[PDB]
């Protein structure tokens, strides 16, 4: 009578896994995206006397840090980081976040943004002089040349804050930015200092890293697992009916 | 004391009927967006307790109260619908369809079991009334 | 459900398709700047914390 609940848990968590996979597939064109991993954990129910019932719980263990494919766009402000490297932005709630989106934009007032989040440089958010032409070097250095003014007047303005962090040290926040895990925060500090060993390429944008093969295989597996759980539910549903209706 | 089985099984039947009704109400409003007050529909569930007054060993079952289910509200990006959020996040009920279908099936089966209990108990009461005759 | 997620995905690719069609229709226009569509994922839902 309670195997129906085990099968129902399996089917519901299969639905959750399918939702995760569909959300990953919907962002196949999202610039600088990290796919969410999925794994079904098994929870064994304790008790007496013969432990037979073990339930299923869907989980998302971090994300995927494999870089995607770089689109070469003839623009100086689109940048791509090294493998396992992160650009730093000031998060929505005045905090710090890390990302791979190298689509740096400028405003009328001259401040650099990523998805609207100001970029954080050595001494707090980077601000470029109003209406200047900007070039980004291979180590984060930013040069600004005013339009029409001796090209001998090009001078650096600041340096981007580029950090290095692996998947174990990084957890996705609800606003799409990545942050440090508590166990990584305890060791590497609240704020990560700039890592000078990371090279950055200017003029190339990093796309998403969702793998179509894994997504399609996962969808097929989810469908088949759901059908098997429905069969288990149906088998349990007939037996209980007969039993009660007759042994009364 | 076979008469108390009438009360026990009747309470069980009423409680299972209420549970089935609540599950069906949740299922029928899985696609709702608005309530009578404009609030999004919140999935609701009954609470089962032992219908035993202080000092009573074992009784039937009773519905204490109906409570809002604890689950994140399903966010949908439709900033064109007249109902929306600051960022266009329409809030839809957190109904888990598989859970509601399984709940409906379980409630029906428990209901039928209680009906069988009542039937056999009435048969026994009649036979007891035919004790010496 | 996953229906809304995949429908949003389909709507984004159609948008991108419309952008590409607009870019390709204005090939011979004088002084035209190509349009490039970028996409963002909406709010992530946390169900249970680690």
């Amino acid at each position: 009578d309670h195997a129906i609940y085990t099968a129902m848990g399996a089917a519901s968590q299969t639905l959750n896994q399918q939702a995760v996979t569909a959300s990953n597939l919907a962002n196949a064109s999202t610039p600088g995206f990290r796919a969410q991993l999925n794994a079904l954990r098994a929870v064994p129910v304790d008790g007496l006397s013969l432990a037979t019932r073990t339930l299923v719980t869907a989980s998302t263990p971090g994300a995927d840090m494999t870089p995607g494919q770089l689109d070469y766009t003839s623009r100086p402000l689109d940048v791509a980081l090294q493998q396992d490297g992160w650009l730093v932005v000031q998060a929505a709630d005045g905090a710090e976040g890390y990302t791979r989106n190298g689509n740096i934009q400028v405003g009328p007032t001259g401040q650099l943004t990523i998805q609207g989040h100001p970029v954080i440089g050595e001494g707090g958010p980077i601000t470029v002089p109003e209406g200047s032409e900007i070039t980004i070097a291979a180590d984060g250095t930013i040069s600004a040349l005013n339009p029409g003014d001796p090209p001998n007047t090009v001078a650096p303005v600041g340096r981007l804050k580029l950090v290095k962090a692996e998947g174990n040290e990084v957890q996705r926040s609800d606003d799409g930015l990545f942050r440090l895990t508590a166990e990584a925060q305890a060791e590497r500090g609240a704020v990560l200092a700039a890592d000078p060993s990371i090279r950055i390429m200017s003029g190339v944008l990093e796309g998403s890293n969702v793998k179509p093969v894994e997504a399609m295989t996962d969808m097929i597996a989810n469908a088949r697992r759901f059908e098997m759980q429905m069969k288990v539910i149906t088998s349990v549903d007939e037996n209980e009916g007969r039993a009660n209706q007759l042994l009364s | 004391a076979l008469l108390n089985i009438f009360d026990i099984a009747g309470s069980a039947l009423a409680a299972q009927s209420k549970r089935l009704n609540v599950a069906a109400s949740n299922l029928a409003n899985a696609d709702s967006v608005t309530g009578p007050d404009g609030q999004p529909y919140r999935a609701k569930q009954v609470v089962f307790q032992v219908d035993a007054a202080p000092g009573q060993a074992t009784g039937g079952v009773k519905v204490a109260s109906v409570i809002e289910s604890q689950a994140p509200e399903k966010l949908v990006y439709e900033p064109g619908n007249p109902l929306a959020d600051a960022n266009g996040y329409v809030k839809m009920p957190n109904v888990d369809v598989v859970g509601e279908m399984v709940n409906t099936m379980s409630a029906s089966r428990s209901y039928q079991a209680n009906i069988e209990v009542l039937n056999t108990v009435k048969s026994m009461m009649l036979k007891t009334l035919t004790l010496g005759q | 459900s996953s229906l809304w997620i995949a429908k949003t995905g389909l709507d984004a690719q159609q948008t991108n398709m419309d952008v590409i069609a607009n870019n390709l229709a204005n090939v011979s226009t004088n002084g035209f700047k190509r349009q490039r569509a970028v996409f963002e994922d909406l709010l992530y839902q946390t169900i249970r914390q680690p």
């Binding site: 129902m8 719980t57 | 569930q45 089962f48 307790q49 204490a64 888990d96 399984v102 709940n103 379980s106 | -």
Partner: peptide
């Protein structure tokens, strides 16, 4: 102390 019957109390609950 009873509780919610069926789906809610037979799915793995959050830790806290």
């Amino acid at each position: 102390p009873g509780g919610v019957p069926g789906a809610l109390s037979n799915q793995p609950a959050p830790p806290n």
